[PDB]
Every structure is written in C-alpha cells, then in structure tokens.
Amino acid sequence: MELSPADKTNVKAAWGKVGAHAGEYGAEALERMFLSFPTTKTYFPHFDLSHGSAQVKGHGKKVADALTNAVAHVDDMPNALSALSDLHAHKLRVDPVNFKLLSHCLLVTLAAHLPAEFTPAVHASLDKFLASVSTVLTSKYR
Amino acid sequence: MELSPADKTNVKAAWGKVGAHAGEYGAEALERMFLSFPTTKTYFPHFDLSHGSAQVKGHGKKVADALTNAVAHVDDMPNALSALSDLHAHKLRVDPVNFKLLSHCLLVTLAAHLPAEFTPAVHASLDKFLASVSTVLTSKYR
Amino acid sequence: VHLTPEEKSAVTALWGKVNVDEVGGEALGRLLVVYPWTQRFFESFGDLSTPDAVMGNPKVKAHGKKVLGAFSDGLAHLDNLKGTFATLSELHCDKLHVDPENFRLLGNVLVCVLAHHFGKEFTPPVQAAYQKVVAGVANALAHKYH
Amino acid sequence: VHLTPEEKSAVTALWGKVNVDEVGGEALGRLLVVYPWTQRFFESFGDLSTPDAVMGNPKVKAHGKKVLGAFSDGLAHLDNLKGTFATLSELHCDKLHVDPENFRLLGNVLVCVLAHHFGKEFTPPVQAAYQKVVAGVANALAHKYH
Ligand code: HEM
Ligand code: HEM
Ligand code: HEM
Ligand code: HEM
C-alpha cells in the first residue's frame, strides 16, 4: 500500500484542521487505546496512566508531532521517520499488532473531533495513512 | 522490512532444495491451512476440499510456481507478481489476514520436509520472505 | 458478553439516540469504501465505482438497514449473543461464505461512525463498552464456522 | 477447549514422544531468532546477538524447559485451560508485563518445531489439533489481563 495523490490531499486537509489540537488529540487517542485494548498497557508499566497525567499528555504530544512530521513529508516517510523506526525496532520493541490498535483509536479520535471533514473518502485516506506510518515504524524490526 | 543478502541466500538455498516437490508442498500447505484455519475455506466454495482433491493439487501447483517465480525475481518482486497483485486486489479480494495463515502453513510444510535445511536462521529468512510476498500481493488492495 | 451494569447502561443509552436505518447505511457504505475488498459479496448491487456511488446506492443502504437491525436486536441479548446469532452464524458460513474477518472490520467502522455521529458524547469509556459489544457480536457470528 | 476424540488422541500420542527439555529450548530459541523484538523480555539472559548465540544460551534452554513444562501441565487439563493457567496469567500481566501476542507467536513457533522434529508424522489433522490447543493456551494465559 501506497498513498495516492488524492490520499495525500485528504490527509493534509484533515491534519491541517487538527492544527494546534494535535497534542490533545494524541493524548485522547492513547487514553482510548488503554481503555479499549488493555493489553497495550503492558508497554507503559513505568507511566502513571491516570486520566490527564502529564506523562500521557506529554507522550500524546510526541506522538502527534511525529504524525505532523509524517504529513509534512508524506512523499518520503521512510527518511522522515528514520530515527523513530530505529527506536521502535531496537529499543522499544512493540509487537506490530499494537500499531493497528493505536491507529484505530487515532481514527476514532479524529472522527469525534472533525464532524465536517470526516467523510468516507477522508476516512479511507486517513486509515491508509496510519497503516503506512505503522509500516514504516516496524520496517526495521528484523 | 527488506530481505538482506543473507536472507536472499537462505531463501534461494531452501527453495533450491524444494525443487520439483514445490507443487506437492503447495498442495500440502493448502490442506494444512483448510484444516487448521477453517475460515479460509470461505474463499473456495467451488472446490472439492477433500483430502487428495485434484483441485487443491492443481491450485497448490499454481501457488508454488508463483513462489518459484518470486524467488527467481527476489530483487524485483513487485513487477514479477504484478498480475497476481491485480488479481487478488480486484477480483479474488481475499482479506489480507489470510496471507499470514497460508505463510504459516507453508513454513510448517517446509519444516516437515527439510529437516536439515530448516535451521533457525533459514526459518527466519523464509518467514521474512513470505511476509514480503504477502505484502506485494496485497499492495493494490486500496 | 460480560459488561458491568455501568457499561450496559452506557451502551443502551447511546443506542436509544441512533437512527438505525441511517447508521446502518453509513456503516455499510463506509466498510465498502474504506476496505474495498469487502465489495466482493455485493456485485449484484450495481454501481460501487466511487465513494459517492457507494454511499448513495439504495441496495447498499437497504442491506445496511438489515444488518444493523439484526445488530440492534442483539443488544437486547448481550448476555446470550452466541445463542442469539447461532443461525445467522451458520448462514454466513454455509451459504454466504463470508470470512468472519469482515465482521471485525464492520465492528471497527461502526465504532468510527458512532464517534462521528456523537462527537464528544462518545467518550473513551463509552467506546470501550462498544468495543466489547462489537467484538462479542463478531465472535458470536463466527462461532459456528467449520 | 473442545477437541473431538480423534484430536485429543492425536495430541496425547505425539506429546508422549516429546522431550520437553529439548523442544522447549528449541521453541523459545526460535521465537527469539525469528521475532527478535521478543528479546525485550530477556535482557538479563546474556548473548542473544546471533542465532547460534541464542540457540546455545543455557539461560534460554533453561527457560524454554520451564515454559514447556507448564505447557505440558495444561495438556493434562484441556477441559479447563482457563482455571489451570489463572495464576500464571496474572503473573504474566501484573509482574512480567508480557503482551499476550507473544503467547500466539510462541504457539506458532512450537507448531513449526513439532513439524521439524516429527516430519511426516505431524500430518495436517495432527497440526490442526495442535493449532486448537496452542490458541487455547494463549487465550487461557491472556485471560486475566486487565
Ligand atoms: C502511529 C504510531 C506511533 C507513533 C508515531 C509513535 C511515536 C513515538 C514517539 C515520537 C516516541 C517518543 C520518542 C522520544 O521520546 O524520543 C515514542 C515512544 C514510545 N512509544 Fe511509540 N509511537 C507509535 C506507536 C506505538 C505503539 C502502538 C506503542 C505501544 C502500544 C508505542 C509505545 C511506545 C513507548 C513505550 C514509548 C516510550 C515511552 C517513554 O518511555 O517515554 N508506540 N513513540
Ligand atoms: C503466498 C500467497 C499466495 C500466492 C503466491 C497465491 C497465488 C495464486 C495463484 C498463482 C493463483 C492462480 C491465478 C490464475 O488462475 O492465474 C491464485 C488464485 C487464487 N487464490 Fe491466491 N495466492 C496466495 C494467497 C492466497 C490466499 C491466502 C487465499 C485465501 C485463503 C487465496 C485465494 C485464492 C483463490 C480463491 C484463487 C482462485 C482459485 C480458483 O478459483 O481456481 N490466495 N493465487
Ligand atoms: C454485525 C454484523 C452482521 C450482522 C448482524 C448480519 C446480519 C445479516 C442478516 C440478518 C442477513 C439476512 C439473512 C436472511 O436473509 O435471513 C444477512 C445477509 C447477508 N450478509 Fe450479513 N450481517 C453482518 C455482517 C455482514 C458483513 C460484514 C458482510 C460482508 C461484508 C455480510 C454479508 C451478507 C450478505 C452478502 C448477505 C446476503 C444478502 C442478500 O442475500 O440480499 N454480512 N446478514
Ligand atoms: C506457553 C506459554 C507460556 C507459559 C506456559 C509460560 C510459563 C512460565 C512459567 C512457569 C514461568 C516461571 C514463573 C515463576 O517465576 O514462578 C514464566 C516466566 C516468565 N515468562 Fe512465561 N510462559 C509462556 C510464554 C511466555 C512468552 C511467550 C514470553 C515472552 C516472549 C514469556 C516471558 C516470561 C518471562 C520474562 C518470565 C520470567 C523469567 C525470569 O524470571 O527471568 N513467557 N513463564
């Protein structure tokens, strides 16, 4: 899977709308993941996962910033996310299944916040975009 | 994930040893798949799936020949498998989850027939290779 | 499924605000658009050429209503989904040949539709309760496969 | 889990020929080689840098034996996998923080190992019975996660 040109247009539009809320959305997506898919909590035993914790809010912001970086460099994600793909492959070692769960929760978060922009075609493009990000982040696993 | 030169060597070596039995092993892998993961039978309502079925045998040969072609063109998989990517994406429309089930069954079949050759390193390279094949086959789904 | 009393009431409360026919058409249409391979069962429905064609197809909408009406009825039997969906499970396997992975995709699309429909009312805890329900329905429908 | 008489006998018969010590070490070692991210739980085990290193590591072999011996115990209680593994399920969640997806990967590698070791005796029907068991065990171990 490769993002079509229309996909790139769709992503940039939706993300553009996220704008300054990217970090708050990143945080909500994580909280949605921890509650919906408790096994993901196994990767954060060192965090206070209480609702509104600074650890979750800060992590949420780092996730969103990396997503913003990927949108900005959609034409070359591999290079843009290189450092993050090394970190996840060599240090964090998150099983690849978990990427699908966070992607789903980010989609839900965007849906709940973008009433006007979350059309069927945008939903499709965002899903593909998150799948591509996930693919790049796990590409150096083995 | 890309295949390293050692992966390529391992794959060509193992497949080299399959040789003329590739068709027989493709049939056995399907059989294993149908018995172990019964949901995969939903894509073959038109076949006789009984043990020994010539339809399974014939299809096993087609699958194996495609994998032989993939090994031969390991540096250029997307082009070599282009017609098969089109077929799966636009006509058969097999859910992507199923490719992991067949891949596992192919690995089991190889293990059962290549005691000497199925070392841990070869096992790892074959799993990566089947995942790459799987990725190419579903690349045009959306 | 095992839901706490709190979870069941969250599920039932939101569901009371749903227009089943509308959400049904939307969820089915979005399944077909977002995961196009699911269109394989629907070639007799006509034009599925574009997002607009899918979302506007009356056959899609009618099928969506049928599917979500059954889902809706299942919500009254949260305690016995397997029994409630047994015959439908057999049908989907033996006659329709639907890979149960499609039920999981539909469940995720449904959650996205509810989120889009309810905005902020679809809180993390409410989503969690619906995730359990959608996984429960998917499992109940896949139960009789063989 | 629910096995037919033929499946239970398939499973039992083969398991009587398994040297747990040896198969356990092989299964754990191959997990660590094939899916290297799983090495995250074994930082204190020593050198895991190459296949040969992993496979000859005495701590890998020791742990492998521990795991398969507990696995063996479940074979004795196929009717109550959940009750059998409840304590270990809680351990793996609360103290070890092991993502249950790892139970699924090990189940698959174990199947590969049995096929490698047994050859033609590990027929399609025998594999099918073992796939049910391995899925049962993984579900039993993930059961107390929260
Ligand atoms: C869209 C997918 C993802 C993106 C863009 C992403 C991005 C990031 C970023 C930017 C960091 C911080 C690096 C730093 O501090 O320098 C990070 C760390 C981390 N990520 Fe990923 N991540 C993703 C998926 C996941 C998933 C699915 C999990 C597990 C369920 C996960 C677990 C972690 C953990 C445990 C850390 C370290 C947290 C800490 O100790 O501060 N990530 N990720
Ligand atoms: C390594 C992965 C796979 C390879 C290399 C492969 C290859 C092929 C080939 C070569 C054909 C014949 C095309 C022709 O007639 O020209 C085919 C057809 C087909 N494949 Fe795939 N396939 C793979 C995975 C799957 C899986 C996982 C499924 C479903 C469980 C599947 C379902 C089918 C079906 C239903 C057909 C049509 C069979 C018929 O009606 O004769 N394939 N595949
Ligand atoms: C919540 C999940 C679902 C429920 C409750 C459900 C329910 C139903 C019901 C009540 C019917 C009519 C059965 C009858 O004629 O007596 C039906 C038919 C059918 N369903 Fe499902 N379904 C679900 C998901 C799916 C999915 C995801 C697909 C495929 C993507 C699918 C494909 C079909 C097809 C092709 C038919 C036959 C339609 C016709 O003949 O007009 N279903 N389903
Ligand atoms: C068939 C599935 C498994 C069974 C039955 C099982 C069983 C066990 C047992 C009996 C122990 C020893 C507990 C004690 O200290 O009293 C243990 C420990 C442990 N297991 Fe599991 N295990 C399984 C799968 C896994 C997997 C797949 C992983 C990760 C890849 C894993 C990671 C660990 C770790 C990290 C420990 C602690 C070892 C130490 O203390 O350093 N286990 N397991």
Side-chain angles (χ1 to χ4, degrees), chain A residues 43 92-93 95 98 141-142, chain D residues 34 37 40 43 99 101:
Chain A
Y43 294 97
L92 305 175
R93 288 126 87 179
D95 189 275
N98 300 102
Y141 273 45
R142 57 175 176 164
Chain D
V34 177
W37 54 93
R40 77 195 303 285
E43 284 303 31
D99 179 354
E101 174 66 17

Side-chain angles (χ1 to χ4, degrees), chain A residues 23-128:
Chain A
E24 165 207 314
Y25 293 179
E28 177 183 331
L30 293 169
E31 171 167 22
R32 291 176 178 286
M33 182 181 74
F34 297 140
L35 286 185
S36 281
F37 308 108
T39 64
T40 63
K41 288 190 295 182
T42 64
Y43 294 97
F44 300 87
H46 56 308
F47 268 35
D48 168 21
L49 297 170
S50 51
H51 165 72
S53 96
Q55 270 159 325
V56 174
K57 293 157 167 182
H59 191 55
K61 194 196 323 180
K62 291 176 230 179
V63 171
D65 287 3
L67 259 10
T68 300
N69 178 34
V71 171
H73 305 277
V74 80
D75 281 319
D76 181 51
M77 292 206 256
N79 284 102
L81 291 183
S82 200
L84 233 36
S85 44
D86 276 316
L87 174 67
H88 285 80
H90 304 323
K91 195 265 206 149
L92 305 175
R93 288 126 87 179
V94 176
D95 189 275
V97 162
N98 300 102
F99 291 86
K100 300 178 270 239
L101 304 179
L102 209 214
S103 292
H104 174 248
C105 296
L106 239 5
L107 219 55
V108 169
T109 296
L110 267 24
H113 287 279
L114 302 182
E117 306 64 20
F118 200 80
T119 60
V122 167
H123 180 166
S125 293
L126 288 167
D127 193 52
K128 296 176 55 173

Side-chain angles (χ1 to χ4, degrees), chain C residues 126-145:
Chain C
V126 175
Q127 171 182 356
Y130 269 90
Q131 293 284 173
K132 284 185 217 170
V133 173
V134 111
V137 171
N139 277 238
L141 279 161
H143 190 235
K144 298 300 220 83
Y145 275 67

